Each structure stands twice: as C-alpha cells, then as structure tokens.
C-alpha cells in the first residue's frame, strides 16, 4: 500500500481557528520582575529649576 505522504493534502491555513483572546491567561503581577533601582538614572542636577527668588 502507498507508504508515502499525500502531496495534495490541504496546505492552506485554517480560517476557522479560534479568533479570540484567551479568557484564562495568567492574571497576576510578575513576582520576578526587577526589584532593584536603576543605576543609570540621571545623576546630574536639573539646570531648568527656577532661578528667581
């Protein structure tokens, strides 16, 4: 019997795939988000503060 693949199998996409967002995602904050401060925060003073008394 024919042992090979079917070269005429439906090659197109599926136009009836589920077109919705997943109602069961992971609805939580990330506990492993970077908890540290930014070392590259601008360490210079602001030259645009008010120069008047």
């Amino acid at each position, epitope marked *: 019997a024919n042992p090979n693949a079917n070269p005429n199998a439906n090659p197109n996409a599926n136009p009836n795939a589920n077109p919705n967002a997943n109602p069961n995602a992971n609805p939580n904050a990330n506990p492993n988000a970077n908890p540290n401060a*930014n*070392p*590259n925060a601008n360490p*210079n003073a602001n*030259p645009n503060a008010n120069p008047n008394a």
Partner: antibody, heavy 121, light 108 residues
Framework: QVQLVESGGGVVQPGRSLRLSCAAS????????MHWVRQTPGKGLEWVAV????????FYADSVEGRFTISRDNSKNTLYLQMNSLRDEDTAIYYC??????????????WGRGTLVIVSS | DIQMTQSPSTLSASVGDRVTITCRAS??????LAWYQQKPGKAPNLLIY???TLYRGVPSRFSGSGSGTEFTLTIGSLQPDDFATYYC??????????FGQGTRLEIK
C-alpha cells in the same frame, strides 16, 4: 578646558585600605555626576561606581559592592573613593570620568589620566 | 550585567579604506550604546552616543548604527590617526555599565 587630576595611588598589600582622590579643575563639579572606571592590565574596561550630583544616591558594580566607598565633596572640587579589603584582581589603572549630562545618556566625555594601584606582596 | 562582545577582536587595514567594527550584546539594550576609541597612553574618548549620534568634535568619517543587540560602527575613510583600540559601552536602564573587549586596528 576641564582637566581631571586624580591621585592617592601606589602599591598596597591584599586586605589593606587605600584612598583615591579626583580633584577637579574649572569643571562645575556640583552639577555633574562622576564615574570611576577600572582598566585592567588585560586591556578591559570595567565600570566601578557613580555618585550623584549632591551625593543623594550611590551605585556600584557587583564586583566592588561593599568593598568600595565613594564620596563627593563639592566644597573643594574633588571626587573621593575609599578602597578597602583588596585582593589581586583590583590591580589596575583607575580612571576618573564625568558623565556628559544627557537626560538618559550615561556617557563620559572628559576622562582623567588615571592613577595606578598595585596589589602585591 | 550584560556581557558586551565586540567582533572582530583585531582587524588590520591600510589608510583610506572602509573598516567596520561591530559589537554583540547578550540581550537587548535598545539604543543605549556608546563607542570609545583608546589610543595607547591615553584614556578612551567618546565618539558615538545613542548608538548612532556623533559627539561634538567627532569627525564625520565616524558613524554608528544598529539597534537591539546588533550594532555597527562604520569608518567613512580610515586615516593614519584612526589607529587605536575601539570599545563598545552600553548604559541600559536598570542595568550596570559594561564595556567590550576592545578592537585593535593595525597598520597594513
């Protein structure tokens, strides 16, 4: 034209303390942050520390956390770094620096010459 | 910390040609990259910030490009005074500053 003079180096034994100074000249020290950069004998540049414009916040690299202490004195125009509990890997030419001053750019413009510290016995 | 790798480590060229030096990032740095050139006996001087912007006083033959992890510093025409060690430095937010190994460009 802004030249950074750094000093206080020499040869120290492992585990002993040492003080480095970065006295400035004609640069507005107070309104600019400062950086220490370590250039290893193997031709590599490692960032060391940065101090804010008024000393409010202070950051270090992981390899120098807790063993290095930097301080900023606006009064006599100098940046200070106290160097403690050393071993062999800290033997390198130590560069002073000055962040350019951009809103989000941590880039050095006016580098210092460098003061070389030896850890040996 | 980000290991900031620049390739090739050493590339030889003669005056007048086009030479490009790139630097690889372990993970995305967006466009917070900087380039420094270090002639022997002198501290490195900045050329490019924001990975594409030429610093003041930088000759126009100096040029930076790239984003993410792939960046390129391109030389418009190599000059006799452009022979030194070149470094790539990133200042990504929430990350510590690291430098590259240093690429050496050598005569002929």
């Amino acid at each position: 034209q802004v030249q950074l003079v750094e000093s206080g180096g020499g040869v120290v034994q492992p585990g002993r303390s040492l003080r480095l100074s970065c006295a400035a000249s004609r640069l507005t020290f107070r309104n600019f942050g400062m950086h220490w950069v370590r250039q290893t004998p193997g031709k590599g540049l490692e960032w060391v520390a940065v101090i804010w414009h008024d000393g409010s916040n202070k950051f270090y690299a992981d390899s120098v956390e807790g063993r290095f202490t930097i301080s900023r004195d606006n009064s006599k125009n100098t940046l200070y770094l106290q160097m403690n509990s050393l071993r062999d890997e800290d033997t390198a030419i130590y560069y002073c620096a000055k962040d350019w001053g951009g809103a989000s750019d941590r880039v050095f413009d006016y580098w210092g010459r460098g003061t070389l510290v030896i850890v040996s016995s | 910390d980000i290991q900031m790798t620049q390739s090739p480590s050493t590339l030889s060229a003669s005056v007048g040609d086009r030479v490009t030096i790139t630097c690889r990032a372990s993970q995305s740095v967006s466009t917070s990259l900087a380039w420094y050139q270090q002639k022997p006996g002198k501290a490195p001087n900045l050329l490019i910030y924001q990975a594409s912007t030429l610093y003041r006083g930088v000759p126009s033959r100096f040029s930076g490009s790239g984003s993410g992890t792939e960046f390129t510093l391109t030389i418009g025409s190599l000059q006799p005074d452009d022979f030194a060690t070149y470094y790539c430095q990133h200042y990504n937010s929430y990350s510590r500053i690291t430098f590259g190994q240093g690429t050496r460009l050598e005569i002929k």
